[PDB]
Amino acid sequence: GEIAQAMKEIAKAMKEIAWAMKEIAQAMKG
Amino acid sequence: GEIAQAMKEIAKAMKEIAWAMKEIAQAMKG
Amino acid sequence: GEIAQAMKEIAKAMKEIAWAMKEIAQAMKG
Amino acid sequence: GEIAQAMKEIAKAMKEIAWAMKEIAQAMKG
Amino acid sequence: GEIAQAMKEIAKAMKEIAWAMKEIAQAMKG
Amino acid sequence: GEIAQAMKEIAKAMKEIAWAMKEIAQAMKG
Amino acid sequence: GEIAQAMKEIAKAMKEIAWAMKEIAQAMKG
């Protein structure tokens, strides 16, 4: 449905944004 | 469909933000 | 209504943020 | 009500974040 | 209630993020 | 309940993101 | 349920994004 599917897509995108931010943090850590 | 339409646009926008953050992470990773 | 109006304004903002993140990613892409 | 007021504040902040992100994209655009 | 409190805290935090993004945009403008 | 817990965790995280983004803005401010 | 599981995944991702943003803020301060 309209609400459940939109929430599942938000969750998948948020997990990918977290993975990318962790890579950027690791590049800038010494 | 004001709530359904907002949630669909938020979900698509978050998928595009996730693609872009993965590209930036890939540019910055060793 | 104030909740439908806020959801609509959040969706339009998220679309603008996605456009901006794509421009930045394109600038940084090798 | 507090839930309606919180949503309206989140919408106003998201609009400001969209404006800033477009300025940053304009500075890095080629 | 815990849900109304969570939404109030989300709103205050997004207002602070919008302030910080405007500062970063002013630094990079030009 | 798990939905109330999720909202509390999202609020705590948004406060930490807002704190971090103000430190980044301070570093970038002349 | 899919909506409860999406909310739990959004909270875990937001907590990881908060950790990453504080590591980046640490890199950028004395």
Author numbering:
A (entry chain F), B (entry chain C), C (entry chain G), D (entry chain E), E (entry chain A), F (entry chain B), ...: 1 to 30
Please give the exact wording used by the authors of the publication that reports this structure.
αHBs are oligomers of 5 or more α-helical peptides that assemble into coiled-coil structures with central solvent-accessible channels. We targeted two properties of αHBs: oligomeric state, which directly affects the internal diameter of the channel; and the identities of channel-facing residues, which fine tune this dimension and introduce different chemistries. The αHBs are loaded with an environment sensitive dye (in this case, 1,6-diphenyl-1,3,5-hexatriene, DPH) that binds within the channels and fluoresces. Accordingly, challenging the array with analytes leads to differential displacement of the dye across the array to give a fluorescent fingerprint.
Despite the requirements for aliphatic residues at a and d, up to 40% of these can be changed to other side chains without compromising barrel integrity. We introduced mutations at one or two of these sites to generate four groups of αHB: Group I had entirely hydrophobic interiors, but with different sizes and shapes of channel; Groups II and III had polar uncharged or polar charged residues, respectively, at specific points along the channel; and Group IV had aromatic residues installed in their channels. In detail, the sixteen Group I peptides included: previous designs for a pentamer, 3 hexamers, 2 heptamers and an octamer all verified by X-ray crystallography;27,29 single and/or double mutations to Ala and Gly at central a and d sites to generate larger channels; a single-Pro mutant at the final d site to kink and open the C-terminal end of the channel; and a variant with all a sites made Met to vary the hydrophobic chemistry used. Finally, one third of the designs were crystallized and yielded 12 X-ray crystal structures, all of which were open αHBs with fully accessible channels. Conversely, the FAs generate signal through interactions with the more-hydrophobic and aromatic-containing channels (Group I and IV).
